[PDB]
Ligand binder design. Structure first.
Ligand code: PLP
Ligand code: PLP
Lengths: 801, 801
């Protein structure tokens, strides 16, 4: 594969040398006792060495050049593995492949040893990871800042068809990429009280929690740029208990909260948020000094959701309390420095911290928040005199049994730019959700449609597809994905049609081999791979997919002799621990497979399997092997989505609603090349207006009725007939996401999917039309937009020495 | 200095190269931002690389050769720093000194950056450290096994004259010597219950705590041998709390219990003891397999006190329960494998675990302990028919309100050899303490007089003394200390007399510079350095030293014009957190200095200072600068001592009682070259027989009376007159260590010390007579004895390729 680079003779000689050097000096092993794991580490250290030169030169270059610096604050960085990605971006894949081969090793076997850096829940976390990659590839002096969770997203195990949660001990064998920096440790304060003296406020009597930075290299695509991702680790500042009690403060960075789009309100989570903000901003203020009028010209702080929103009052605290800037100048600086990115409209995702909890944990911040609110509302009152309810709606403070602070409101008030993550989402922010904020400051609202990196999500996971594409158009598309459009010229090319189809079958055979090897699960390779992989939530409607699967099963039993395109339906994703419904849903999926997968009448004509522990590395295996991409969220619920983009970039056809980025993907490729179905936002609203009555659908659709009765009677749970009563009850009477309402259109749409799959040539030509138009969804495009429209810096693909 | 080795041109070139390589690749720094700390680490990694080749070859050699293996189980390993020691044993000191010099660095400045591996309390821990060094130098296939405490002995701070305890975060900047081995992690079980089936007992329903090994290299003196010290680290095997709760099991290896010679009975301590035993023995059984009749021929398990005593029932558990050996054969194997080393006779040091606590935590072990006891007592009854009280005295089980298990009794019953740590101590074990065990099995009891390593304790800490010695007798003494005897030939050599005196003054100027630099404390360089450094306990009698200091002060005030040899009295050591008296004593020391050090009449004629945070690295600084070594424990209380040996090896004259190894040191050098004083064990016994009445001494000694009244009235605590009432009360009515009884002889003896110090020539000639006869106290001699008399292996100084 030519996109994998050259295997120079000297380069390969040096690689083997250093591989052996590390096995000896770093791992202290001989080839007599060395295990594949040792071999993976020897290679990892060898590859890591290649990053050091550029890593130091890059940061040095930024110091010499002094460009505006971008600080991307996020509570999650879903990075995945680093070995292949590092090799790809440094052009060392083939060389390492050859070197390890000469040493009698299978580099791919070694790559499977690496642990995912799963410091993210799903989309939001992964976007930050793709962003770091694009910001590096775009030559930006960007700094990712987050927290180094000791345990990332829990490793999911399926036991008895039920999800089981296990600690994700990802640092067990160490992390060869990060560089601990105990020397740059900073103090973070909690609790305490405020003293207002003759020099102003003073935050005193606080408990200290030290923040230890760990820096990880972020390589751009072959431009010799290596940026940094800084993750903070919590460190403590009779006798035995006191030493043991050091655990309490160090628990702050222990584990990533596994909630997806759901606000909890745990004090430990709030501490984690402030912890990353306080430390990060100390780093920022100091770097800046090595005056404050030019702060926004040299500093950009991007908030990934409201998680690090505390950076607004924190920046104010620093400038006013410690730097002695007058409130007004400080605020001008703050707003021009901060920008906020909203990721969802679902109300239960919004962060509204009880004022009492903020008053106790961060007394000085609450005071600053109240002051920010007064002046902000004062502005609203001056723009809309007499509009009292607007004041109540716009307020950062929410009244109720428990007074709270709306963090989204704080972010809008404290940032010069606010953006949605897809056109439809960004429009609704201005239309509904923040309509009032939009009317006050229209110029603040923007859109930055999400994207995925073509490196990890194409060249890395699909070397075969990337090769045949390069064969025709060169390698330039790799960091210029819009060039994929030149592929529309091959819709009638018999060679390309053959190859696209060939690559997809190879990926499917590979994924089949993976499942056979790791889980002993056998799937039919000559079946349509229908895949829905994403976090398990009601708004994503894995239940709608379940209804369809059962429909296919019942239709086969009713007319056995009737041919149907064979399908292997794969659903994967994690349910948040404690979310009862999401876990009942995972159980229904395995429960359906228990019947379906063992019916002799059905045989290998239909198979339903649940992909265990869906994570970044699994996404890289299954997505390139998918035929149909399921993106069936209820219209108006999925802000953007990114998994949809990955499936489009990898040769799968999409079946979905006009929601999130699905809309822009259909527009890019042409609605005729997308399997669009069901309600549109407007239709959902009309149902809401008159009230959603699931009974009507049940009453009017005999096939749906049959499935509800099978679930109800215990057809899919013979030993425990009433096992799914809650799913049934929710569907019939408390379904906020109208599953039944899109049932008919969905089943009909799937019929068309099968129809097209029956025609291999047309299936593939439509696929080509999809890949050829996925270009807009590369994160390089998104980041360039952030750079020019929000940060105020010009991106550049120019190489460093 | 010639004992420091050669500075080869190529060697120096390569060192600098690798130093720079590590600064770049390992530390990811440039010389623009590098700090001395970075420089220390760059050198440390560079030096560590030199150990790897031999480390792998040595272990490989032991595998090929298959010699009997020695497993030294200890709960403490007071290692101190590793950089200089590594350089010394590999002959790289001068080369590294030159290399770093050429790089513009002061290697000694860099050495001060290293953190002590203070995983020990005092003597017992340090002996294990010196033993590892000697076992390596003696070519033994020896393996040190312990626990990797996250926090070693607390760092002591003196605040307001009071000791303050701070966590000893020694791994904060990492440990460049150890090699983590997560791949060799083993499971350790706790709690649970026993199931007696048809295949015997089965330990089930236990909670698991994983033991992660960390291996540290142990270099022998220039023989190319590099053994291993294995330290185990505890690892865990709604959702958030469960992840946080992983801390509980990991707390097992968190911090070293700071008690010196005092049994507590904390369950966490018992868990730590079993943790090291279970893991260590798993390693031992496995290694052995890669049959059991030859186990004792291939395995030696040395127990450093009763801390790892659980290895006896644990070995039995393994052989009977898991290996299916009949009880009798298993026991024969066990006893022949285990040997026990007793370190103290003080009753409050003995480990007597409540049976209920053992029954709960290790149910199967208690059962085995009871079975061991029955059969053992059965043997006693058969050897002494009708002697019922002997049975009660020898029993492993102790009756009382709370039934307990005597671990010392378990160790004697389960080992083929039992030894004291000095001749006097070993004799009393046979005479009193274990008189009954001795009568049953006389052949079991031995003596292994302690020793210290001449490498760390001479060549390392006193390069000057080691140089002048080498100038006359060569370097052979370094690993053959008995050769120091050839120095008796220079008692009249004017050159040697000049040089010994010169070296001592250089060490004193250096220690003075240290105190000035680090603590801003100024000491008179032309004063007698009177030093007592050791853990703070009543039996060590720092209080006796205090009484003398006050005597000197009162005598100066009474006769100001009377010349007295100027003295800088230095007392240092840590008091166990919670030991009220030991801490009151530290306060009295600083309290005396507060008066003495500020009396204008006294001036620089007498100074009392408390050396803060006494630890291995401090011992290396102060001992070589000491004139008088204080070893004044009450006769019969200090089993051996090792600090005394260090002072003798380094040119200090000793003032002490006929206790522990003091006795053998006087015998080696000649009592006329030692300042021996006070009661002998026999005299203590007679006082005990009639009852110790401190009042008598108070009544008959006017000078002592004066001091007690000064303490009582508040002369040394004006702001709090009653501050020392407890010390006074204890001395007058509850002194178990008869301080007053040795007061007169002690003050008189100190008078003779001053008399001799007035004659520099004779002082030095007597010193020479001391250094020349310290040879017997090198740990190489002790270990060789252990090897031939207990382990059954022949030591060897032979070099490896
Ligand atoms: C891309 C990605 C996501 C996001 O998928 P959506 O379907 O947009 O929610 C979630 N998890 C992982 C492992 C991903 O790689
Ligand atoms: C040698 C040593 C000891 C033992 O000293 P003694 O006076 O025998 O009790 C204690 N602590 C340290 C730091 C040592 O080096």
């Amino acid at each position: 594969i030519s996109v994998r680079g050259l295997a120079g003779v000297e380069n390969v000689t040096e690689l083997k040398k250093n591989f052996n050097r590390h096995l000896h000096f770093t791992l202290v092993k001989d080839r007599n006792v060395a295990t594949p794991r040792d071999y993976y580490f020897a290679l990892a250290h060898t590859v890591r060495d290649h990053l050091v030169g550029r890593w130091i030169r890059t940061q040095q270059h930024y110091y010499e050049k002094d460009p505006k610096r971008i600080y991307y604050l996020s509570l999650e960085f879903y990075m995945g593995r680093t070995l292949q990605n590092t090799m790809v971006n440094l052009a060392l894949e083939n060389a390492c492949d050859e070197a390890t081969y000469q040493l009698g090793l299978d580099m791919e076997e070694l790559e499977e040893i690496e642990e995912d850096a799963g410091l993210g829940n799903g989309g939001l976390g992964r976007l930050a990871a793709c962003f770091l990659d694009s910001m590096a590839t775009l030559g930006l002096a960007a700094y990712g800042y987050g927290i180094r969770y000791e345990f990332g997203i829990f490793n999911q195990k399926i036991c008895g068809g039920w999800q089981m949660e296990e600690a994700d001990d990802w640092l067990r064998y160490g992390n060869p990429w990060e560089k601990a920096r105990p020397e740059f440790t900073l103090p973070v304060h909690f609790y305490g009280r405020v003293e207002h003296t003759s020099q102003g406020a003073k935050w005193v009597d606080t408990q200290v929690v030290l923040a230890m930075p760990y820096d990880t290299p972020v390589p751009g695509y072959r431009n010799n740029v290596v940026n940094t991702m800084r993750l903070w680790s919590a460190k403590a500042p009779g006798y035995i208990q006191a030493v043991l009690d050091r655990n309490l403060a160090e628990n702050i960075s222990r584990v990533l909260y596994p909630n997806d789009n759901f606000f909890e309100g745990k004090e430990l989570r709030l501490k984690q948020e402030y912890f990353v903000v306080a430390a990060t901003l100390q780093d920022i203020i100091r770097r800046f000094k090595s005056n404050f009028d030019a702060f926004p010209d040299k500093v950009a702080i991007q908030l990934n959701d409201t998680h690090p929103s505390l950076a607004i009052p924190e920046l104010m605290r620093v400038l006013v309390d410690l730097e002695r800037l007058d409130w007004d100048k400080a605020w001008e600086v703050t707003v021009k420095t901060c920008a906020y990115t909203n990721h969802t409209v679902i109300p239960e995702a919004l962060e509204r911290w009880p004022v009492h909890l903020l008053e106790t944990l961060l007394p000085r911040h609450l005071q600053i928040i109240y002051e920010i609110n007064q002046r902000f509302l004062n502005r609203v009152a001056a723009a809309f005199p007499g509009d009292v309810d607007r004041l109540r709606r716009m307020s950062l403070v929410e009244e109720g049994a428990v007074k709270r602070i709306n963090m989204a409101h704080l972010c809008i008030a404290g940032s010069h730019a606010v953006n949605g993550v897809a056109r439809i989402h960004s429009e609704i922010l201005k239309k509904t959700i923040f309509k009032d904020f939009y009317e006050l400051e229209p110029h603040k609202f923007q859109n930055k449609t999400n994207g995925i990196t073509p490196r990890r999500w194409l060249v890395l996971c699909n070397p075969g597809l990337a090769e045949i594409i390069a064969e025709r158009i060169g390698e330039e598309y790799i960091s210029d994905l819009d060039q994929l459009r030149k592929l529309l010229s091959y819709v009638d090319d018999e060679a390309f049609i053959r190859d696209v189809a060939k690559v997809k079958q190879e990926n499917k055979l590979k994924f089949a081999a993976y499942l056979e090897r790791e889980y002993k699960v056998h799937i039919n390779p000559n079946s349509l791979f229908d895949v829905q992989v994403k976090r398990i939530h009601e708004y994503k409607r894995q239940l709608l997919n379940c209804l369809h699967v059962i429909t296919l099963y019942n239709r086969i039993k009713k007319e056995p002799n009737k041919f149907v395109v064979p399908r292997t339906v794969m659903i994967g994703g994690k349910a948040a621990p404690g979310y009862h419904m999401a876990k009942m849903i995972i159980k229904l999926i395995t429960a359906i497979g228990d019947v379906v997968n063992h019916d002799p009448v059905v045989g290998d004509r239909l198979r339903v399997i649940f992909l265990e522990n869906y994570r970044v590395s699994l996404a890289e295996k299954v997505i390139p092997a998918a035929d149909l991409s399921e993106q069936i969220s209820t219209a108006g619920t999925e802000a953007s989505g990114t998994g949809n983009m990955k499936f489009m970039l990898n040769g799968a056809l999409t079946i979905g609603t006009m929601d999130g980025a699905n809309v822009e993907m259909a527009e890019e490729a042409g609605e005729e090349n997308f399997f669009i179905f069901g309600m549109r936002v407007e239709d959902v609203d009309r149902l809401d207006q008159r009230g959603y009555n699931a009974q009507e659908y049940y009453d009017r659709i005999p096939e749906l009725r049959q499935i509800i009765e099978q679930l109800s009677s215990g057809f899919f749970s013979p030993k425990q007939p009433d096992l799914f009563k809650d799913i049934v009850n929710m569907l019939m009477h408390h379904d906020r996401f109208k599953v039944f309402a899109d049932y008919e259109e969905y089943v009909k749409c799937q019929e068309r999917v099968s129809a097209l799959y029956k025609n291999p040539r047309e299936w593939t030509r439509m696929v080509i039309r999809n890949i050829a138009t996925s270009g807009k969804f590369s994160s390089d495009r998104t980041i360039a937009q952030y750079a020019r429209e929000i940060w105020g810096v010009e991106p550049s693909r120019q190489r460093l020495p």
